[PDB]
Write a protein that binds this ligand. Structure first.
Ligand SMILES: *[C@@H]1O[C@H](CO)[C@@H](O)[C@H](O)[C@H]1NC(C)=O
Ligand SMILES: *[C@@H]1O[C@H](CO)[C@@H](O)[C@H](O)[C@H]1NC(C)=O
Lengths: 129, 562, 295, 103
């Protein structure tokens, strides 16, 4: 029922721009924290960026702060990623992931990192360098 | 946008609009029914629209007719005011299906189809209750439809007939066959019809609209069960003869059809005698209000109670009544009024209501749960409050049992809460069941003193004495009129009674166990009663094979009254 | 003989009783079933439960009565909270997630889900409401998610002091106790004969007989009569057609569109002709106005 | 054609316990309806299927004896009630029952 499919990518020169989007179909959780992940060949996959679902509290990683822009639209239940000024170390296998929000301490808190329920097939983003 | 205009001509209805009253088969018999129909030879508004107030009333039902062949007409809308404040019907036709909705849409001045959108029809739908989808109805021709709403049930009948090149409605007969019934159940006072125009483009349309009435009809089924002829029962006396005799042919002779009477026109008002006016000024404003434990009670009778001037006596907000209405107290008439004025606490103002319990209720002032009257409470902090603190007001605190309705307690003593007798000294387990109210101008709203006046009205069990100044307009002297006398409903033509009703007499019984003299309490006048003129109607006519001319004879009445 | 309407559809009990996923208790899935024949004997083959639990009707008496609409509410709850699924119940689920009117006429089926709703790490996709301002009204659900406030100061969108989240995630494990195992619950509610009914069992209209004096209860009409073929043209949608005496003479069938005629069964009077009793005891019997073939 | 007196009083004060009162049972299933003023004490496994029950309450095997649940917190219609009914046999034989009328 729940499926995560991504679109976009390719090979661009350094300093270029790309648009990546992963569409969530059949999602039913009321509160959830979807995340985007990347994994270069030879390195462990790590969290990149995520925002809250209720109001959109944006969070970023240090290495992609500013250069990565995200937006979540509830009309299509699809999250869109904007990347500009791409650099050679950004070449990796990029994935989209979806997971529910943690419920501890009687509050609404969105958590990423590991422990993700669902994942996408992934895409390849390469920099000519 | 306003881009359509409309013109209205008028024509006769001829003999059209007879639908199968019940889905039941018969054969070669005549059936008499009573239902909604279009009375014959009635009034028809030929509408012609061209590219406007499409606010066409709905009444009880609607008969619609059209002769266009371009399928320009589409769907119908029904409602009572057709805004977003009330629900409305959304029967919209389509070449594929048909959809009906009920919701508080916002229709503009002229809903229409863009053609395939209905945004101009309505902006949005907020609180919807019903939806329905089915097969579409509409499929040189004359198309007739009848829509009605009985017992919350919306029924449509239809017929498609072939017509030659004829200017007006063709004669003959054509039955209507039922198509649809739905359970909507709303009030609908008017309806509109929608048109579809491409884009815009010029267009024209024409149709006929009529309203129906509940009548008694007679119908003739042929040997296959198809209606070929019908006869109305309230068109002309010959039709009445046909309906009574239950046949389509009337032979030479004389027949009796029905009776005639003179209908009443007005009504007569006869209130109790009036000489004085009620002293309302000595109760609401007297610079003195009795204590709650010892409340005053004033009896008001034999006077006119002008409740309108009550607002000018005390600075209260509004009345609150249980068995009567504050604005309707000037019409109903009561034999006795009781006034109970007292002073209570601000928070105790809510403690006067049937089915309530409190310290004041069961110990100071009690009213029956069937109380019929009004209560008026207003703050009096500027008169019953002192800087030192008011001390005159007292209320009872202890009692052995709850007070019965309309019961007061004034007797004082030393309440005993112990086994040993009090012996007249307030020592241990001996208290005083009378505490003084603490009133100060610096206290809160709920602790400020409040003056409460309770008015209790007695229903019509005895001769009434207290009510408003209703004029006893004399019922002229020669009018067939009804009369309502203290519960007696009657009718007749009524003169002045020459009868000598001795002062004790108020009603006159005739030989036939009915009244023939009545009494008005406003002025001691006894009135003579006779029945309104009435008689029978007969019809004299030769055989139907000769002519339809008839003569009407009214029995026992000269040509002077209808 | 008897009457039944034209229902040929089969009610879809396969999709509701098993769909490899269940909605949460706070947002219970509700489906309406109508205009079909419901076979409740196949319900046992779809879910691994023990026995039915019906209040207004009996489990063995669901294939006879005909109802207007059927409502099915499906969710998953905890093992010990199944007791809270009963009429007039009190509890967290009773007044915060699912409330039932006290006049419930239906059934409830609950059965364990330890092999699908339990994970070694711990299931967390199922949540239930914990805090609510007021008790839930009958047949009412809550979907809105917000920050519950239990203090004077506003929460201001931050879950600080006197700020809670009324959505607790269920903890399901395969090593948990019986009262904590996840359980699938389906509540079926029925509507009585207020509108033309649409859901009941497929029993023929007694295979309409012909040329016999027969008792019958046709759609509540009790009587007797002889039924024969018809030569009258009933219009598309007539059900009963009467005579001068306002009694039916031609009839349709709600299980197959056929036109039939009704006649009264033959009857008459009996007269006895005897000589004087002092003469002989021999008598003669005559049937008045009857041909000498039927007798 | 009943003629007689009926006296009913709520006895929720003595027939209800905090744990729940199951003292009273009712028959839920029966092959045929009951004649007027007839009881039924016989207890057996009711069979609702073609196969015999064989004394085992398995499939298509029910118990026509369901225990009542009486509690003091239940609704008025759910509270236990005690009913005493008096029925009279009229004059067909030498009458035996009547008040103290002096001869
Ligand atoms: C039709 O309606 C018009 C408008 O009131 C009226 O004046 C006219 O007399 C009516 N026609 C007939 C035949 O009554
Ligand atoms: C009635 O139907 C028969 C055949 O079904 C036909 O011959 C006859 O013309 C019909 N009746 C009329 C008035 O047309």
């Amino acid at each position: 029922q729940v499926q995560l499919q991504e679109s976009g990518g390719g090979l661009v020169q350094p300093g270029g721009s790309l648009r990546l989007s992963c569409a969530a179909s059949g999602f039913t959780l009321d509160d959830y924290a979807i995340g985007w992940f990347r994994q270069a060949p030879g390195k462990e996959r790590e969290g990149v960026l995520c925002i809250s679902a209720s109001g959109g509290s944006t969070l970023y990683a240090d290495s992609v702060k500013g250069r990565f822009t995200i937006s979540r639209d509830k009309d299509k239940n699809t999250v869109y990623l904007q990347m500009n000024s791409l650099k050679p170390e950004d070449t990796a296998v990029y994935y989209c992931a979806a997971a529910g929000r943690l419920d501890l301490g009687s509050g609404y808190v969105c958590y990423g990192y590991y422990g993700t329920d669902y994942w996408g097939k992934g895409t390849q983003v390469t920099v000519s360098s | 946008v306003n881009l359509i205009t409309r013109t209205q001509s008028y024509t006769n209805s001829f003999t059209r609009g007879v639908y199968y009253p019940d889905k039941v088969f018969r054969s070669s018999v005549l059936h008499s029914t009573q239902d909604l129909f279009l009375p014959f030879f009635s009034n028809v508004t030929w509408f012609h629209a061209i590219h406007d107030n499409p606010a066409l009333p709905f009444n009880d039902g609607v008969y619609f007719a059209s002769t266009e062949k371009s399928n320009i007409i589409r769907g119908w809308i029904f409602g009572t005011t057709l805004d977003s404040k009330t629900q409305s019907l959304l029967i919209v036709n389509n070449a594929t299906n048909v959809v009906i909705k009920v919701c508080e849409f916002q229709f503009c001045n002229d809903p229409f189809l863009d053609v395939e959108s209905e945004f101009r029809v309505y902006s949005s739908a907020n609180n919807c209750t019903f939806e329905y989808v089915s097969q579409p109805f509409l499929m040189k021709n004359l198309r007739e439809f009848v829509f009605k709403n009985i017992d919350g049930y919306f029924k449509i009948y239809s017929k498609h007939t072939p017509i030659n090149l004829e200017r007006d409605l063709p004669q003959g007969f054509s039955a209507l066959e039922p198509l649809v019934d739905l359970p909507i159940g709303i009030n609908i006072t008017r309806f509109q019809t929608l048109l579809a125009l491409h884009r815009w483009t010029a267009g024209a349309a024409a149709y006929y609209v009529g309203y129906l009435q509940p009548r008694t009809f007679l119908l003739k089924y042929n040997e296959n069960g198809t209606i070929t002829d019908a006869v109305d029962c309230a068109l002309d006396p010959l039709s009445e003869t046909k309906c009574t005799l239950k046949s389509f042919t009337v032979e030479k002779g004389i027949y009796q059809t029905s009776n005639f009477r003179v209908q009443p026109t007005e009504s007569i008002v006869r209130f109790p005698n009036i000489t004085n006016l009620c002293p309302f000024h000595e109760v609401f404003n007297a610079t003195t209000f009795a204590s709650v434990y010892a409340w005053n009670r004033k009896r008001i009778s034999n006077c006119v109670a002008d409740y309108s001037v009550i607002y000018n006596f005390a600075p209260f907000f509004a009345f609150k009544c249980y068995g009567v209405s504050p604005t309707k107290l000037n019409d109903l008439c009561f034999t006795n009024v009781y006034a109970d004025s007292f002073v209570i606490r601000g928070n105790e103002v809510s403690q006067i209501a049937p089915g309530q319990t409190g310290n004041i209720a069961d110990y100071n002032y009690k009213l029956p749960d069937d109380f019929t009257g009004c209560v008026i409470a207003w703050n009096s902090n500027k008169l019953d409050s002192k800087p030192s603190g008011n001390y005159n007001y007292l209320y009872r605190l202890f009692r052995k049992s709850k007070l019965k309705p309309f019961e007061r307690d004034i007797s004082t003593e030393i309440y005993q809460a112990g086994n040993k007798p009090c012996n007249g000294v307030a020592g241990p387990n001996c208290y005083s069941p009378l505490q003084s109210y603490g009133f100060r101008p610096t206290y809160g709203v709920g602790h400020q003193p409040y003056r409460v006046v309770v008015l209790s009205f007695e229903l019509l069990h005895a001769p009434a004495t207290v009510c408003g100044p209703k004029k006893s307009t004399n019922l002229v002297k020669n009018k067939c009129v009804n009369f309502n006398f203290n519960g007696l409903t009657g009718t007749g033509v009524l003169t002045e009674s020459n009868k000598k009703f001795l002062p004790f007499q108020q009603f006159g019984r005739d030989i036939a166990d009915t009244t023939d003299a009545v009494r008005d309490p406003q002025t001691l006048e006894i009135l003579d009663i006779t029945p309104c003129s009435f008689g029978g109607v007969s019809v004299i006519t030769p055989g139907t094979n000769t002519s339809n001319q008839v003569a009407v004879l009214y029995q026992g009445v000269n040509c002077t009254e209808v």
